[PDB]
C-alpha cells in the first residue's frame, strides 16, 4: 500500500517465504502508527468492494486454511504465491493458534499490492466473535492490547462477504441458505457485517451443504439453517448457478464434490485438532471455469 | 479539491446550503468551490460518508457577479407606501395566507404600477423578482 505500508508488506511476504515450508505460527507484527495506517487503508479497500466479489480466472482457490501459516505457505508455494496467483478462501480462514495473523497479514498485503490476486472468506471457525471463533479475539487479547484488537475487528467487519468465479462457481463458506433471496440485497449489505447464528450469511458461514433437508432445517452450529439439496437446487436454478463452495468442516478427503459436482466441499484443514485427521485440499479454478480438486496434506 | 481541501469535508460536518461557494486555501491560493447540487436538502452535512459528486466544471466569475447583482432598495427612496402595499399583496398574502383566509377576502390579484418607467420602475420589478420566491 503506502510507502511504509508497502515496505511492511514486502517484509511480511519475505518473512512468510522464509517461514514457508516450516512449522506454522508466524505473526508478522508491525509498528504502531504504520499498523494503524495499514489497518485503515485495508478497511477502506475492503469496504470499497461490494459484498459479492468476482474472481479473476484462472485462480488457485484453497479450502479452509483454519488459520495455519504452514498450510497457507504450502498453498502459496504450490498453488501460486501472491500476486503470481489469485487466491480465494472459501471460509474458516482464521482459527485457533498463532498462525492466522500471518495469513491475514499476507492476504491484506497481497490485496494492497494486487486486489485481483488476493481474496479470503470466513466461516464458522473464522467468525468475528469469540463465541464462534476465539482463535482471533482471545489471541489478540492475550498478545496485544484492546485498541489494536478493536481496529482489527473494525477492519474485518469492513470486509466483503462472498465471491464468484466467472458467475459459475459460488465461493461460499458452507452450504446454501433459505434466507438468501437474490444479489440485490447482498450487494446492498455493505460494511459492517458478521457471521450470525441463523439466517442466510449465518447458514453460509456456520452451516454446510445439507442433503437431509429440502428447504431449510437445523445445522451443525445448532442455530444455522443448513439448506438441503432442494433449496440449493432451487437457488441454483433461479440464479443460474452451477457450483457452490463448502468449508468449515473436517473433510477426510479434503475436497468433496457434493450435489453432483455442484458443491465442491474443499477443506484445507490438515489434522483438525490432531484427533480428526482431516485432509487438506484446494479448488484449482482454471480460466474456463474448470474446477479441479487440488488435494493437500492432512 | 481532493488534494487541497481533503479534511475540509471528510468527517468535518459541513452543513452548507446546496449552491454555496467557499474559498479554500489550497496550492498557495484560495480555491472557491461552488456547491453544484446535493442529493439531500440544501443544508446537507458534508461528511466523509457523504459522497461529494465532483466534475471538472469551473464556475466563471460572471455568475459570481450576477449573484452579487442582487436587487433591493438601492435606487428607491421614499416609495414606502408602494413597497408596503406590494409586500402585503405578496408577503402578507404568502407569509400570512391564513390572515387572508380569516379576512374572508382575497387580495388584489391585478395591481397596476403607473409612473415614469425605468426610473426605478424596471428596478422595482427586479427587486420584486429577487425578493419573490414564487414564479
Amino acid at each position: 500500500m503506502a510507502d511504509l505500508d508497502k515496505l511492511n508488506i514486502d517484509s511480511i511476504i519475505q518473512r512468510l517465504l522464509e517461514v514457508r515450508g516450516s512449522k506454522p505460527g508466524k505473526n508478522v507484527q508491525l509498528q504502531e502508527n504504520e499498523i494503524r495506517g495499514l489497518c485503515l487503508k485495508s478497511r477502506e479497500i475492503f469496504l470499497s468492494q461490494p459484498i459479492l466479489l468476482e474472481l479473476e480466472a484462472p485462480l488457485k482457490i484453497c479450502g479452509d486454511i483454519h488459520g495455519q501459516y504452514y498450510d497457507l505457505l504450502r498453498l502459496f508455494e504450490y498453488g501460486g504465491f501472491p500476486p503470481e496467483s489469485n487466491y480465494l478462501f472459501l471460509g474458516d480462514y482464521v482459527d485457533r493458534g498463532k498462525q492466522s495473523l500471518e495469513t491475514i497479514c499476507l492476504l491484506l498485503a497481497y490485496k494492497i499490492k494486487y486486489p485481483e490476486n488476493f481474496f479470503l472468506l470466513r466461516g464458522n471457525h473464522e467468525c468475528a466473535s469469540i463465541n464462534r471463533i476465539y482463535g482471533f479475539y482471545d489471541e489478540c487479547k492475550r498478545r496485544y492490547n484492546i485498541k489494536l484488537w478493536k481496529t482489527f475487528t473494525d477492519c474485518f467487519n469492513c470486509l466483503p462477504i462472498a465471491a464468484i468465479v466467472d458467475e459459475k462457481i459460488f465461493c461460499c463458506h458452507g452450504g446454501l441458505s433459505p434466507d438468501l433471496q437474490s444479489m440485490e440485497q447482498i450487494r446492498r449489505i455493505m460494511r459492517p457485517t458478521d457471521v450470525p447464528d441463523q439466517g442466510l450469511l449465518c447458514d453460509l458461514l456456520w452451516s454446510d451443504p445439507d442433503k437431509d433437508v429440502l428447504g431449510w432445517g437445523e445445522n451443525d452450529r445448532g442455530v444455522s439453517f443448513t439448506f438441503g439439496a432442494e433449496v440449493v437446487a432451487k437457488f441454483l436454478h433461479k440464479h443460474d448457478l452451477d457450483l457452490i463452495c463448502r468449508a468449515h468442516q473436517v473433510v477426510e478427503d479434503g475436497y468433496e464434490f457434493f450435489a453432483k459436482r455442484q458443491l465442491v466441499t474443499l477443506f484445507s484443514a490438515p489434522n483438525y485438532c490432531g484427533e480428526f485427521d482431516n485432509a487438506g485440499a484446494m479448488m484449482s479454478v482454471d480460466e474456463t471455469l474448470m474446477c479441479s480438486f487440488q488435494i493437500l496434506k492432512p | 479539491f481532493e488534494v487541497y481541501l481533503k479534511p475540509y469535508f471528510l468527517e468535518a460536518y459541513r452543513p452548507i446550503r446546496k449552491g454555496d461557494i467557499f474559498l479554500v486555501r489550497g496550492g498557495m491560493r484560495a480555491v472557491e468551490f461552488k456547491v453544484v447540487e446535493t442529493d439531500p436538502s440544501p443544508y446537507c452535512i458534508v461528511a466523509p460518508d457523504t459522497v461529494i459528486h465532483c466534475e471538472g466544471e469551473p464556475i466563471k466569475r460572471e455568475d459570481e457577479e450576477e449573484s452579487l447583482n442582487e436587487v433591493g432598495y438601492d435606487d428607491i427612496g421614499g416609495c414606502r407606501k408602494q413597497l408596503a402595499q406590494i409586500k402585503e399583496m405578496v408577503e402578507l398574502p404568502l407569509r400570512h395566507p391564513a390572515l387572508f383566509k380569516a379576512i374572508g377576502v382575497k387580495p388584489p390579484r391585478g395591481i397596476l404600477l403607473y409612473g415614469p418607467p425605468g426610473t426605478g420602475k424596471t428596478l422595482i420589478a427586479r427587486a420584486v423578482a429577487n425578493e419573490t420566491g414564487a414564479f
Binding site: - | 479539491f1 468527517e11 453544484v36 442529493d39 461529494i52 465532483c54 466534475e55
Partner: peptide, 11 residues
C-alpha cells in the same frame, strides 16, 4: 458537471 458518476475524493 455530473453527480455520483466520478470516483470522488476518498478520505
Amino acid at each position: 458537471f455530473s453527480g455520483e458518476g466520478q470516483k470522488l475524493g476518498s478520505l
